[PDB]
Write a protein that binds this DNA or RNA. Sequence first.
DNA 1: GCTTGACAAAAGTGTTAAATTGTGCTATACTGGGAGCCGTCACGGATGC
RNA 2: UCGA
Lengths: 95, 129, 293, 155, 93, 100, 1113
Amino acid sequence: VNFFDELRIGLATADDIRNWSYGEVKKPETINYRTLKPEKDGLFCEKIFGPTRDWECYCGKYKRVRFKGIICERCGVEVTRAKVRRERMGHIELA
Amino acid sequence: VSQDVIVREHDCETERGINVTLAERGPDIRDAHVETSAFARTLATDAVDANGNVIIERGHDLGDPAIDALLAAGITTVKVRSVLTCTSATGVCAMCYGRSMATGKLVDIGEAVGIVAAQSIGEPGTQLT
Amino acid sequence: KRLKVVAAFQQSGNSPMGMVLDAVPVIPPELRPMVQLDGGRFATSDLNDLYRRVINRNNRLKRLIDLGAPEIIVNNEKRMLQESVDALFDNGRRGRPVTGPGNRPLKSLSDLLKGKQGRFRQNLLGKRVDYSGRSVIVVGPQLKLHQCGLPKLMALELFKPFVMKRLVDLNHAQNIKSAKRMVERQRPQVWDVLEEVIAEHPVLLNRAPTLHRLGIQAFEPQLVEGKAIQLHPLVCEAFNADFDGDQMAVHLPLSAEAQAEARILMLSSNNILSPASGKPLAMPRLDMVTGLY
Amino acid sequence: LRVQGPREVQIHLVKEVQEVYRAQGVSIHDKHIEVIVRQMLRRVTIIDSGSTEFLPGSLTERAEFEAENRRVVAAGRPVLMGITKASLATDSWLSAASFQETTRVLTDAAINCRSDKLNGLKENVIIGKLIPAGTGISRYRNINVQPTEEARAAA
Amino acid sequence: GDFIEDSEAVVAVDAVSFTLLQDQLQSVLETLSEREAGVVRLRFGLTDGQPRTLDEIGQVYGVTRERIRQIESKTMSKLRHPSRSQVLRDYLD
Amino acid sequence: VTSIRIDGVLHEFTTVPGVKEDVTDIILNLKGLVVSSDDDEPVTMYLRKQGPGVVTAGDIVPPAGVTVHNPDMHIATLNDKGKLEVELVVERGRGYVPAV
Amino acid sequence: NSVPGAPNRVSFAKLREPLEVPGLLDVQTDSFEWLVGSDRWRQAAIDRGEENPVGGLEEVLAELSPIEDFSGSMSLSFSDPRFDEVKASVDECKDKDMTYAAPLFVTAEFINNNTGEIKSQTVFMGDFPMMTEKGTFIINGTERVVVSQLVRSPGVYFDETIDKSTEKTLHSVKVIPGRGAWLEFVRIDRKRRQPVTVLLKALGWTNENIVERFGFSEIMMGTLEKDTTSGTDEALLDIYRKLRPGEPPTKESAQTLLENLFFKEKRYDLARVGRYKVNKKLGLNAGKPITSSTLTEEDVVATIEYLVRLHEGQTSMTVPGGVEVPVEVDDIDHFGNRRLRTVGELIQNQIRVGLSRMERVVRERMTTQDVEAITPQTLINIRPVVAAIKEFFGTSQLSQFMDQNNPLSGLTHKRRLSALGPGGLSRERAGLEVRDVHPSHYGRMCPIETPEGPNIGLIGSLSVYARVNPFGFIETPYRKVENGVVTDQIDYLTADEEDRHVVAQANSPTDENGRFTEDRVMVRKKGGEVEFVSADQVDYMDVSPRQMVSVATAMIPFLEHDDANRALMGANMQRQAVPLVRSEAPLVGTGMELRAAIDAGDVVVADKTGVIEEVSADYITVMADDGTRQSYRLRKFARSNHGTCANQRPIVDAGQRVEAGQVIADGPCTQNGEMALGKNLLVAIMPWEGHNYEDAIILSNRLVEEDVLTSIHIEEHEIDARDTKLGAEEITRDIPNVSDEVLADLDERGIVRIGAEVRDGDILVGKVTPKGETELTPEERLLRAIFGEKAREVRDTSLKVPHGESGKVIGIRVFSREDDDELPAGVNELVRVYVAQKRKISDGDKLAGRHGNKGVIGKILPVEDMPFLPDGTPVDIILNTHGVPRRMNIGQILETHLGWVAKAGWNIDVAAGVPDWASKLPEELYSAPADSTVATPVFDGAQEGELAGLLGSTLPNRDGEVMVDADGKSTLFDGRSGEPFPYPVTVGYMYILKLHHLVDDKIHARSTGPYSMITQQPLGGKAQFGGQRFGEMECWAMQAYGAAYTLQELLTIKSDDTVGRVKVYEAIVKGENIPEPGIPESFKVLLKELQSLCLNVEVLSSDGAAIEMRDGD
DNA sequence: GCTTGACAAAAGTGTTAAATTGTGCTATACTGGGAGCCGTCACGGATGC
RNA sequence: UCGA
Ligand SMILES: [Zn+2]
Ligand SMILES: [Zn+2]
């Protein structure tokens, strides 16, 4: 749209950060050393940040654009565009 | 600091201004620099002589031909319209600023003079010691 | 001075609790990318390891708490978590920065915004643009004040999409694929087509550094042989461009509004006077002076 | 400034600034130096009162101070500040963030829950909007063009 | 970091070429039997996007999977024939 | 002369065995050739020199209707191992044309 | 001259060189020989100097010997460094991409006599990189050069400042060690707020001793009068806690801590240079054996005495029991206090770090590793040692890629002196005090030559006759003169020693027998300040002019007539020249080209007198008179490190006879043994119809037809076949999607054919990579069925020549894995293709003279229409007249007149009495043939009177007519108009160079290309095919005009708008209008970055509430 | 013009041999890191003394 | 590390 009057700043409360996040990253893992896939519950995990391939669940049950807005029951990845990986944020629950 | 300054309106209509030296104490002359100060300006209030002939009316562009006539009349001062006295709630008005230096005419309603002034001062800075 | 902060929290509705974090947001992956380049070797952003130090120390703290531990070990782990989050947001602001291999300080979220290399002065207040090029400048003493010599190879790549649609308009090529291959292969047909789109299509010339607005001026392109650029000798005073090997850049306006601003506002013939003192900036100088004198 | 008032400080600054540039043979116009000087004296200190969240020892714009001071249902003196301190006091918090001391500018804006109206041109440049100047003024860009009926008849 | 180009970034020419390629296939497939064109659309998926199979296409047109392979072969030889394929040579890749 | 051809070299940047010069330096020496041809269509001369000695401009056997006006020109110097076989294309034209 | 093959170039020098120019590569070779037991360096130290020479390796092994476990029961001793023959020839190293090194052997004895005694062994530290005969190194196949760093020598240097409190002067003292904690006067180890008198009580000094030494001139006595406590042991507890205050201090630990921190050699390492500096500077151990560790006490007692002495101003100070030495403040820039760390020493420091990094493993290993039987074989890990060497030659600022455009650039690089680097100042950290030339730079560092960028004053070139000391201080030769008579004696003086004498001027009157002819003579005192004295007080004299200027500077004719600025540009641009096809020596030039050419190493020299047996383009063979047979292989069209050609040509005839040191084959830029960096062109200086305007230049088309300015450029391309995660990469002709017509130039293997031509976009090497899953669209994969072309599992990744270049393929280099070869993990086949091209001189290419005159080519007129003499001989270059007077470089005019003088023959009448213009005239130079070469040494040159007289000369242009008058101007004829020019113009032969800055490399154009990953903006550089940066200052200019749409267009659809750029491309191709821009992608990234900092940011509409750019905002 | 049945290929599909992966454990006695840092310059304003 |  590119027509909006003002942009406001402020402080993000712990609840604001939790509402932004699509999941908690529970492990300091990036990618598998063999398959080079985004291992689950780490950084890059498709369960939260979104799929690597467009309209593809991690396990490959839903590979086509017919079904979107659904989450694979096995791999727990939502079927949508891979661009969401740019906009989707996680969070860490501190002890 | 000056990038947000642009010419918003034609005239602020205020009567305030500042004084220019314009040829002091000659002869028995003129001034070293009248082109940096008096030139390109716009007269704030009427310039009158000793007997009040009112040689040059308000708002004149104060070109070199106007300076000669002012010197012939014998007045050593003129109150000029400047951006310091300009009200113009937002930005500045074209009449207070003065003649556009590149155009040689009055300033357009769209000219952004803050960036132009910043570049005008900054560019020669390589020659200072 | 202490009141300003106390009053700031009083006027707004944000609780001061926001100054302590019970949760740390995680930046999306594509903004901290991990990708491979040559033959399998990998490259990743520094945030991933700064995050790693945070998550690793946070989980080790959970393990110490469940077992139960002397306060010496737990508190030591807690301050480690405190510095790991600090190093993530701003590295080096408190004590020594977290260093990588060879004593290189890791880039932190705050380092992304700050500095000449930050998001602002680097990727925001300035950007790298398409439809542009550069080359050396040579004197164009035979040019008109509004004209500039443009290398034919440069103009071909700059106007490539235009000449493509033109030789598709004409039957010289079928569809758009043979048009692109015909431009890339230099086949002689496109030369007559380039002069057609080049006509009365202005371009912007830039000579860095740009001190004033006259450092950028619009010209009418004239297809010229060779790889150099022909510049009008009068505009040299504006660009402060010596012919000792200076390089200049060219940009191509596209939308009708852009072309109009180049013809009216930024045309070379339109600005002959310095918009500071008022003295004419483009006037006979050097050879022309002694030539007329 | 403490003696001769605001209008004289602007005369003194332009005189001194032009004197340095004249010594090297550089000829500029006083109107330019006045454009820069005008921005230094646009703020006033608030000594007392304010009647509504106008704190003592604070620097607020004169025009905005004149509107709030009405409140017929605050006292201060004009100040003189450098261009850096003035450009850092701009009402646009991301304009000061892109200028200098990005870290300090951000923490202060977030604590005050500041809001940027996206008025100045540096803001419109960052967000990819049309700058509010030149051909970007609210008037020029809305111009409507139509052929005159007398001229259309020729076709 | 500034030297790594985005591999998945969309190229303009190929994206514009894909549209002009879609425009050309519509005209070529438009000249055919309305039932022959439907078999080719379901086979490769086209509009739907999911390539079907002979048996699935057999329930819609009410024929055996063998009868469609006959239709698929006859329409392919008609597609390979130069009047239709002379324009698509540039799109090999 | 337009183009030349040598059996042993596939390009201009290699040296021929047994000779003091290189192909580039030999071509820079061949530029000084002054030839005259009465045939519009192109024709090829031939030069073959074995054993030690100095190859000069007269060692080329001209086809029918062409001649060489400076046989004293120095081309190359070879030794016992040196052998030079080269054919050159003489053409008709005017002015200056670069390498095609 | 003085060289066997030296051609004949007459010199105008009024003096004779008493000293020959020393070996110009000695700076690199001498330091490297000192490092590794070179018997050549062993003799040098033995004949004059100590009888116990110690190599750089031997001295570091002496530091490491022995290694003890702290129990004293066992010890590990090192000794006897051993080197064997190099692993491979440098040619094979540069070819195989392997470093050029020789193995290292040593002796390590494991002794434990507490238990049963152990045994010795022979240890191998690793393959050690060795410096070549050219003074360079081969590291991983690339030719590199280790530069010489400028570091502040260890020692004591005192300064005086003006306190801000009062106008009275102050004195601060700083002792600078190499590895020490550097206490400063009395802050120690960077601990502020320190008293002066606490140290004596800290050292245990009795109170009565302070009064004796400090009683004179008050001062410290007053400082001793005011103190916290007077207790000797109490001062320990006061100072010991000040520095460390943590973990409460122990009584015994604090006593010996200062001896540990300073007196101990382990924590405080006494510098062998500083030991010499401070001992003789302060008078301690005067004329005593060296190699003393950190000063016990006496030296520190002299520092405090020197400080109080400096306040009083007493010049003569005798340390108690010591000698007397002047008391004065020191200048840091004086080359006596600033030394040059050489290549051998720089490598030594890295070996020291490698050995120190090893002992940590050995010390930790000897304790916990078995017992009694381990020996060095058990655990001695040399990985950290060799890593220190490998990590140094790369990544280090001192070790740089050899810069070689021409043999000059390579030579000047090796003698370079730069202050920046590890252990040195950063470029921003460096003040303006170092950049200014110091009076001590005379004859040592060249003041003219330096960079014009941010590096001004930091980088410099070592002088001609200078050479480095064993301690690192530069020495300069001088002719000792005693009692007003010049002597044959020559002594090398260095800084401090140079100030103790007065230096006569090299240029001075000399009688036949020899002596000071004039009554009053010039000299330069210890100021340095010029002085006019008499022969009585003169001791040393310059060996000759140009002692200061370096090689590149000394190669500029008429250097004294040009300003230092343009002279710096002329010297820098000389190393920026390029080898031409036929390089011809300069018509007029100083005699430095001869010597500098043979010392660069890029030419061929004969090392034995004899007769040539065979001559060929590939190699030359010489038969020595002693019976031996030597051969020299000629580098043929080798690609230089920067892309130029190194082709060499033989200058000798088969049956000729050579001599030791005589030239054989010329180098890339050379002619018959001299440095040829350019061509001699006929130049008329006049403005020509605006085509040469403001430094622009115009060329004669003859230069293009005759190739005089043509150069060759070779380029190297490389690609590898690696094992991938999904399979193996295959190099072949099988590229999946291509027309068979485009692969016609490939052989079966899939590479390009040698000798074939190419162009931007062609396939040099075809390759392939697997992909999966394929996942083809519905539309595509329909054509696969009709056209029956099976979609290949592999994806096409090939090697294609980039945009804007072409040429012929010179050669190929392929390393297969099937063939053993050598390859890193994952790679199978490695292929390199070498493409070259003949570059004609084109419009826009940069030409420059030797005086700093530079400019591009504005146009090239055909030979028909060009200003030409009455000869009918057209000129070559037309130089703009307006540029000569302003730039303050008039030497170009002098060499232009002299260039014409030397071109045509010239004969002096001389009559019977000779012209007086020739009283001090050149000797026996009166005559000279046509096209004669002449030499004009810098400060002994051809003077003004001679030039005028030289203009009168023989000018037989095919006939009797002379084409140049005595004023050097000729009447030119316009070839375009047909009428003569109205006035006489200056014509002559100048010497111009072709510079590596070429239009073909610099031209760049882009419409759409690769985009950055994080931000969608394009990239930079031509290699990446990137776009131009539209920066902050350029946006200001765009806003000053007031054009909003042009600015928004550049910052949205031109760059960061993901959906806008493809739509704009779609609109242009379809002929539609350009659509409306979107939001720059970098702004969305900016919001996400702010959200990571925990700043809640929202973009909200004027009405209602906030909106979302995407899933989140 | 379409269908049949037999028919081979392919595509899953469930089940088992296998590799990969994670956690625990080792009992002479051993208990507080080592690394380092020299060459701005000018300024403002807190913070610390 | 160099070019304006
Ligand atoms: Zn799934
Ligand atoms: Zn006004």
